[PDB]
Design a protein around this ligand. Structure first.
Ligand SMILES: [Mg+2]
Ligand SMILES: [Mg+2]
Ligand code: NA
Ligand code: NA
Length: 326
DNA sequence: CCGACGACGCATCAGC
DNA sequence: GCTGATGCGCC
DNA sequence: GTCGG
């Protein structure tokens, strides 16, 4: 947090390029520089000092010099004043509304929270629920509450089938004091990379978690991935808990280690790792690590019997989940 | 200089 | 209905 | 926007 001002500035520029400019690589470049600056153990004195870090080039260096001198950035100050940009940036905060939908709504005059509420019939299902729990979804989940939700999910899943294994990943597994949402990896013996010996494996759990009124809403749902909303039960006279985003991901049992590496994150860590995998001649997804054959095509899945093995292939020393918060 | 930037599931749509 | 492209989101 | 070829 030594450079909190800088990283906030860069994160804001990242969100600008992603939402308004619709330039996904600029957004990624900014988020990368923010990440590598975030863990830099010195209070940065100059842009030139920052340019040494991987991901900080000439442009960001110049902005950091402007920021450190004045405490602001004129590029952001203007963007803060632009009506179209302020609108798009807000609309994109509703889950389900991306850069395209945001710009399309503004063209119709739908640009405020009030406009969205009088026009629910123009939102798809995801966007309606996103609008519904707009306030709740911007609150953080204390680890105390993550531990409660974990006990519920892990015990309800045990009740459907004793052989289900649920593992809460995300920043929770990274040991964070708070989480923005809950992330659940799910494995069952029947679902392997060889055969689905048993249908509705994800459905059964979703239905069970709905019956005990944990899962309250569904954003999207398929055979392997669930996206929805959940809420902790409150006692008598208690004000209710905020509604929380939950993601449940069914991964084949034998591909657990690539799956648990992947949803443990962070998102930037994964990208840095997967980019590095390519430089070392491998491609990594949620399922497998595969070699890159002489001409580009991915080879066959290499054997993986721990998270560390994936680190070994690409010549990385192992990094505990708590050290992946990039 | 300039090509490449991680990799994928689900909802949604256009084309046939 | 199927196939693929696009939008949005997950880490 | 940045970097490695
Ligand atoms: Mg999360
Ligand atoms: Mg999530
Ligand atoms: Na640099
Ligand atoms: Na959004």
């Amino acid at each position: 947090t030594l450079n909190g001002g800088i990283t906030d500035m860069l994160t804001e520029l990242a969100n600008f390029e992603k939402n308004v400019s619709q330039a996904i690589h600029k957004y990624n470049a900014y988020r990368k520089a923010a990440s590598v600056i975030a863990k830099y153990p010195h209070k940065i004195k100059s842009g030139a000092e920052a340019k040494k870090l991987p991901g900080v080039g000439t442009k960001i260096a110049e902005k950091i010099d402007e920021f450190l001198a004045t405490g602001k950035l004129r590029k952001l100050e203007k963007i803060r004043q632009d009506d179209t940009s302020s609108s798009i940036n807000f609309l994109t905060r509703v889950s389900g509304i991306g850069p395209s939908a945001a710009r399309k709504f503004v063209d119709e005059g739908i640009k405020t929270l009030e406009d969205l509420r009088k026009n629910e019939d123009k939102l798809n299902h995801h966007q309606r629920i996103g609008l519904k729990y707009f306030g709740d979804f911007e609150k953080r989940i204390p680890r105390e509450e993550m531990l409660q939700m974990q006990d519920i999910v892990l015990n309800e899943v045990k009740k459907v089938d004793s052989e289900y294994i649920a593992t809460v990943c995300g920043s929770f597994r990274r040991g964070a004091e708070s989480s923005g949402d809950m992330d659940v990896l799910l494995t069952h013996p029947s679902f392997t990379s060889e055969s689905t010996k048993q249908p509705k494996l994800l459905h059964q759990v979703v239905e069970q978690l709905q019956k005990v009124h944990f899962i309250t809403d569904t954003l999207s749902k398929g055979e392997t991935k669930f996206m929805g909303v959940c809420q902790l039960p409150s006692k008598n006279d208690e004000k209710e808990y905020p509604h929380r985003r939950i993601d449940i991901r069914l991964i084949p049992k034998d591909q657990y280690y690539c799956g648990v590496l992947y949803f443990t994150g962070s998102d930037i860590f994964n990208k840095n790792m997967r980019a590095h995998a390519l430089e070392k001649g491998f491609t990594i997804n949620e399922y497998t690590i595969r070699p890159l054959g002489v001409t580009g095509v991915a080879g066959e899945p290499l054997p993986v019997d721990s998270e560390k093995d994936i680190f070994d292939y690409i010549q990385w020393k192992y990094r505990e989940p708590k050290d992946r918060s990039e």
